[PDB]
Amino acid sequence: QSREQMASDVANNKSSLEDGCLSCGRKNPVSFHPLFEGGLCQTCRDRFLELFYMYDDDGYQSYCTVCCEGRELLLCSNTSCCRCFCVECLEVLVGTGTAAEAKLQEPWSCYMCLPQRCHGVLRRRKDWNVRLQAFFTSDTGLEYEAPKLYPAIPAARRRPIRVLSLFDGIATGYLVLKELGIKVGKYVASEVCENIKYVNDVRNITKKNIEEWGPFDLVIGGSNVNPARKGLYEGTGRLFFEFYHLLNYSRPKEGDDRPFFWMFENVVAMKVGDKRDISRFLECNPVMIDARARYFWGNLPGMNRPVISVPVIRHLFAPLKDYFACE
Template sequence: HADFPGFEESEAPGPDRVEQHSARGEFCRPEVELLSLVRNVVIQGELVRQDSWGKDQIALEIKNNKRRIEEICISCGSLQVITQHPLFEGGLCDPCKDNFLESIFLYDQDGYQSYCTICCGGSKVLMCGNSGCKRCYCCECLDALVNPGAAKIAEAMDHWTCFMCRSARFFGLLRRKRKWQLKLKQFFDQESEHLRIYAPVPINRQNPIRVLSLFSNVTKDLQDIRILDRVPDSNQEMLTFFEDLDNITRQNIEQRGPFDFVIGACPQNPSVDHSSGRIIFQYCRILQYARPNEAEERPFFWMFMDPETLTENDINDASRFLECDPVIIHDISDSVRLWSNIPSLKSKFAANMYNPTWKKRGKNTTEKTYMKMVKQFLVPLKDYFKSYI
């Protein structure tokens, strides 16, 4: 692939000039056909624009006023910095910090980040061509932080690999942090009042996700949305399904586990023997059995789905037992209520993200089809487990 002119890899750039570094596509896989696709970002039905940002002043502040990049918000150019960006060297102002906390884990229906990885905004973004990455970067950030005209050069490339996927860490003023996985966790632990996350796992250390499915077998559904491989290792069962939980004990779960993801779906028509209240109790009981010990820091996720069949008392009980409030995901003809610890479902924007082109379904739809409605909210799992998305 052609190189970016002047983007040769070098030592860390000095504060008085904007260096340029390599943007080669050596990590692009040949089968990737994503090219350097450019799209307008539409969130909540509106085009996201931040034309008033002062990103173009970042390089001038560093060159002319001798400011350190840590003193400047790399998302908008503000000098009112209150914290540091978790992924790249540079500061964040208060509004941009809040925006990052709410938006970094949001993904569109196509599986790509909804917002720029750097600023969590942007009117036009470039999608990484590296299979499995799914990150986006806005043209404004590339031109302001990498080099003027960098976005146009990237657009013209056959395969553009993003700054989180390359071996080099320095790209003009954009400098990826060492151990960014840990720093991202520390950022949320310090700055977020409602969300705690696990440190993302480097790709070379990721394993396939081990799923415990309760009440409904979601193997095919998870394969369809590519959370599970269609051809799993024959020596290892990656999904365990229990429908009747009355006789399931802690020992049963420990023998079949450990599990990384526990998912349960409340049936649309609970039977007398399996009332909605009892289903909630059974799910919470098994969830406690499957949770890792507090001393373990391995990523562990869970989700309980309700196709809006629970009573108000049941909803309150579920929220109390699961220690979080639900999010309702709307569609044209359906909606589903979700309790989960997956980061994307903790965003205040989550309930407004849905697919308006979803085909209208009949009354007899089973709860398993709701997995397609929540596909985009499962994308963050790729940062922890081997992904087929």
Template structure:
């Protein structure tokens, strides 16, 4: 079997078929929060789970018994408490050797796993301070206005922010929290060339189309070309309508986001249409919760988001800082917060992340908001229920991630005077 690429986590290589399987399933999780497949081969029917409550790794019988020695799986399965090879690298034996720079290699692997090469994006020179204008932004699939919130926090002057969104709860959050300063235009499919000419020209296009029919965790997914997967092509259509001509020196930036655990063929097709490879960013490096996402775009510096190795060891925020009662904390970090109620459960036993009055308890809405980077009570509008608030949060972007990505635009656009 010919080696197509080096394994990003452990010493060794992957063939083309295993590479595609690895890229599709490494970030796929079961309802218990653990990886759906073995960390080494991304397959395996029988697995042993790591007992570290902050870890989600599992290792299959074949990998353990073949790469280390026969009987390893049975030995670890019968061990009362076991921390995996990722948590305790000194345990690595035989042919299972963890790479010291695995975190950097993982990001490189996902950035280049489409096996396509593209011309670099056009680089725009910085604009002199006196010539910088306020931003005009078009946000597709806007959600709860994360883009607007981040741009205002960064101090940008915003001339116009037009948002396409069809969820009434999300629109209510954006309208109320931003006092009607966002212009809503509803369904992205109704936006025409004429509309864009009337509203623009835009400086920034952002969006992340629905992931339901792309995510491999959905057994009924329809893929990129059916169902909600087709909405990606609405972003692509509008991107092409907004791109300035070659002779136009006006800077134009764009950002597209979607899930990591998608079919390799769908990812390759998205790369082919957008003419670039994505960067993988997990919000765990700048927040207390996992949220691995692909980002495509031409934002300055986005391919070098930050040093993964240094941020993992130094930059992670303490989960306790985000709790109303820090003494109730049961875990250092939480897993990806989604629209499902059971996403809060952690570890083998399905514990909830905090203790309240001596009992396991879920996160409060205000705690979830802070973990995502939103102000407390950001989604507390229109008497929305707890589940409604979790749903709009579960579909949103991580504020600190978007802040890191959009901050370099300060070299191009006007900002408010500092008080």
């Protein structure tokens, strides 16, 4: 069916807006549009999971906020709201190009700023800040078990922590552990090339080195004009698999019940096939945290609790105080 057919039906008020693809007009939707009132088709929802969170170097939205396909973008003059809208969306979902005709005459505020009003067959849904959150980090074709919770330890038998790291920032995980007053005293750093025991070229670390330098108690990792748009065209395969290999090396053997925590970090703007691969290999599901949206895999205690990027890492690492000795 054509996009005008759905608008005609809505103007007749003879159907619901969740019967076709709001971005393409194709029927048989698979999910719901998290912002407006409409359905999402199968091929039109995969593109929404990648490009919806992409900002260019200008600080403005890269693609359309409705169809995520940009050919001629009109801008939101209001600051702290960098949304941009398409050129045919404003003529099909509003009714005509009258808004476009009046768009360039004066500075314009987008549809996410002005008080809610049904500007035709396009209705800003009342609540979006929650179902948008539930749209991304849920509704996936995998289901795993909750991680095993280690029992807490009394402070009379607490020892300093031992950290192996592979973050982008060499010392990013060192300062955070110092602001919390946790007993540092073992720290090995590295990087993916092309008390801190810095060693470059992670290609040089062997199993025997992990055996001698260990045992470890926390393994972390995950890390130029357009750092946000070059990510899709480059790929993140190299960064994940060396972290996975070293996590396999350092993981406690069978019959050992000592605590062991890990965490992986990645940005949201990535292809739909990589998230499934990481979830399958790591045997868990991510939780998004908004400060720059980011995914987080791991087994740290209380990882999906509500918020009460140094602050984000501090929030994530806070519940570690009751396992390892402080000060």
